[PDB]
């Protein structure tokens with residue numbers, strides 16, 4: 001006979017929610033991977049992907 | 051103290067004084083859920099616990 005503390009509760013997850021910006025275009029990985037000429041290691045090229 | 055072998059001092063009046071004394075009695079009753087504090091709502095982390 002007495003009062004007993006138990007485990008904390010929270011509501012179980014029901015579904016998964018994904019919220020992303022509605023961007024449609026694809027960056028050209030073809031000009032990165034299927035590129036013709038590659039720069040040297042002392043003059044390595046950096047391309048911005050955004 | 052003006053001590054002597056035949057001299058004594060007797061008070062002729064008195065003063066009633068009130069002094070304040072403060073003592074702690076209780077403490078804030080805290081309760082911690084160990085599973086929640088270690089990692090919340092994670093079943094994989096709870097399995098490792």
Ligand SMILES: *[C@@H]1O[C@H](CO)[C@@H](O)[C@H](O)[C@H]1NC(C)=O
Nearest residue numbers: 028029030031032033034035
């Ligand atoms: C890149 O080359 C691979 C290998 O042939 C090919 O499957 C792929 O379609 C090419 N991608 C582009 C964008 O040309």
